[PDB]
C-alpha cells in the first residue's frame, strides 16, 4: 500500500493520544508509547499530562507511588518510567545487546564482564525487599571481597556499571528517600506483576509490535536505532522481522519503504491527512520514536536548534505532523520560537495550546509571545 506522511503523522497522534483528545491513565500513556524518558522528572510528568483531555501531571507521581508504573534504565540506557507487567521484553532486548561486554566498556568502567555477572548476582540477592540508597548499595557490596578492590570504581562510575543490572530486571527505582534515589529488585517490588524475563526472540515481537503500534510505518534502520543506537545484530534484526511475516505490512510512504502492522494498514489508509497545532514538551516521544534524525519530520538544518548539546531536547512546535519550532517557558510566559522558513502561526491556535500547556503545568495562564 501507499500513504502521505501527514497520514502517518496524524496515524500516529492518534496512536499517541495527541488527536483528539481522551483522558488516559498515566499508564495508558507510558504502555502505548513504549516509554517515557524520565531522566528530567518535570518533563516527563508534562508528556504525560499533555496526552490528557484534562491535563493531571500528579497522576504520573500517584501511579509511581501505588507501583503501576517502574522507573529504570532501558533503551539506548536511558532512564524511563515503564509499566512493570510490560518491562521484560524490553529490558531483554536491551541486555541482548551486550554493550558492556565491549573491550570499550571494560577499559571505561573497569569492571569485567565476570564482574558484571558477580555483580547481578549480589545486587540481586541485597536488594530483594530492600531498599537502598546508591551509596548503602555500594557499602554492601565492597563488604564483599569479590568487590571491595572495586571501591573506587563503583562510586564514580555507578551510572554505567549499573546498567547491565537494570537491562538484567535485577534492580529499578525504589520509592525516594526525601531527595535522595534508592534502588530496588523489581521482583520484590512488583511482586505479582513482575513476570519472569523472556528470552530475546520471543520478546522482540512484542517489543517491535509495540514500537509500530506507535510510531510506526517504520524501517528497521529506524527501530533498532529507537531501541539502541544500532547496537543490535543486523542478520538478528532481519530474522525478528521476517519471522513475523504477514504481521507485517510493507508501506511506501512517499518514496520510503516500512513496515506497518497488518492490523493497522486500513486503519492508516483510512486516516486524513495531519492537520493543526500541538505543542509537545522536551524529550516527547512523539519525537523520539522516529528520532530527531529523521528529516521528514525535522528539517537537517533546524536539528540543533533542537537537539542541542549534552543530549538536550528542547520542546517544540509541531504543525501538521512535522517540528517548525521550538518554545519555552520564560517568566511564566510561552515563548514560541519558530524557524526562519516557518509559516506564520495561527495566534489563536498558538494560545489554544498555551491553555492546555498552562494546565498540565498547574498555572493558571500562560501569556503567548511568538519571537
Same mark, same amino acid.
Not at 351 to 371: N, Y
Given at each position: 500500500?501507499?500513504? =502521505? ?12 493520544? $495527541?488527536? &483528539? ?10 504502555? *502505548? ?13 508534562? /508528556?504525560?499530562? $499533555? ?9 504520573? %507521581? ?17 532512564? !524511563?518510567?515503564?509499566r512493570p507487567s510490560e518491562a521484560g521484553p524490553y529490558l531483554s532486548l536491551m541486555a541482548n545487546t551486550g554493550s558492556w561486554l565491549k573491550p570499550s566498556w571494560t577499559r571505561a568502567s573497569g569492571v ?47 551510572? =554505567? @556499571?549499573?546498567?547491565? $543490572? +537494570?537491562? *538484567?530486571?535485577?534492580?529499578? !527505582?525504589?520509592? /525516594?528517600?526525601? /531527595? ?19 528470552? &530475546? ?5 512484542? @517489543? ?5 503500534? +506507535? ?14 543506537? %544500532?547496537?543490535?545484530?543486523? &542478520?538478528?534484526? *532481519? ?11 510493507? @508501506? ?11 492490523? !493497522? ?12 497545532? *500541538? ?10 520514536? &522516529? ?10 538544518? !533546524? ?12 520542546? @517544540? ?5 512535522r517540528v517548525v519550532g521550538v518554545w519555552e517557558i520564560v517568566d511564566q510566559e510561552l515563548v514560541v520560537t519558530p524557524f526562519p522558513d516557518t509559516e506564520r502561526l495561527p495566534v489563536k491556535a498558538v ?9 498540565? =503545568? ?10
Open positions: 500500500m501507499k500513504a =502521505s506522511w501527514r497520514q502517518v503523522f496524524a496515524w500516529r497522534m492518534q496512536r499517541q493520544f $495527541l488527536e &483528539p483528545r481522551t483522558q488516559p491513565s498515566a499508564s495508558d500513556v507510558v504502555g *502505548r508509547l513504549c516509554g517515557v524518558q524520565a531522566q528530567v522528572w518535570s518533563v516527563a510528568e508534562l /508528556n504525560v499530562a $499533555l496526552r490528557q483531555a484534562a491535563p493531571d501531571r500528579e497522576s504520573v %507521581n500517584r501511579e509511581v507511588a501505588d507501583l503501576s508504573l517502574m522507573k529504570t534504565w532501558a533503551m539506548r540506557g536511558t532512564l !524511563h518510567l515503564l569485567t564482564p565476570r564482574q558484571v555477572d558477580e555483580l547481578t548476582e549480589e545486587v540481586a540477592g541485597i536488594l530483594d525487599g530492600v531498599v537502598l540508597t546508591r551509596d548503602e548499595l555500594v557499602t554492601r557490596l565492597v563488604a564483599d571481597k569479590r568487590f571491595v578492590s572495586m571501591e573506587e570504581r563503583l562510586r564514580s562510575g555507578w551510572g =554505567s @556499571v549499573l546498567k547491565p $543490572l +537494570a537491562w *538484567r530486571g535485577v534492580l529499578c !527505582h525504589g520509592p /525516594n528517600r526525601g /531527595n535522595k534515589i534508592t534502588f530496588t529488585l523489581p521482583a520484590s517490588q512488583f511482586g505479582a506483576d513482575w513476570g519472569k524475563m523472556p528470552e &530475546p526472540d520471543e520478546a522482540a515481537p512484542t @517489543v517491535i509490535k509495540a514500537y509500530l503500534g +506507535a510510531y510506526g510505518p517504520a524501517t528497521i534502520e529506524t527501530f533498532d536505532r529507537w531501541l539502541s543506537l %544500532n547496537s543490535t545484530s543486523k &542478520p538478528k534484526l *532481519r530474522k525478528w522481522f521476517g519471522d513475523m511475516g504477514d504481521e507485517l505490512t510493507e @508501506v511506501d510512504v512517499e518514496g520510503r519503504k516500512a513496515f506497518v502492522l497488518t492490523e !493497522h494498514a486500513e486503519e492508516l489508509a483510512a486516516t486524513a491527512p495531519c492537520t493543526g497545532i *500541538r505543542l509537545l514538551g522536551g524529550f516527547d516521544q512523539y519525537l523520539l520514536g &522516529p528520532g530527531t534524525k529523521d528529516e521528514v519530520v525535522l528539517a537537517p538544518e !533546524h536539528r540543533s536548534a533542537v537537539s542541542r548539546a549534552a543530549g538536550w531536547i528542547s520542546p @517544540v512546535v509541531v504543525k501538521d505532523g494560545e489554544k495550546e498555551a491553555a492546555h500547556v498552562a494546565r498540565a =503545568s498547574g498555572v493558571s495562564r500562560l501569556p503567548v509571545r511568538i519571537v
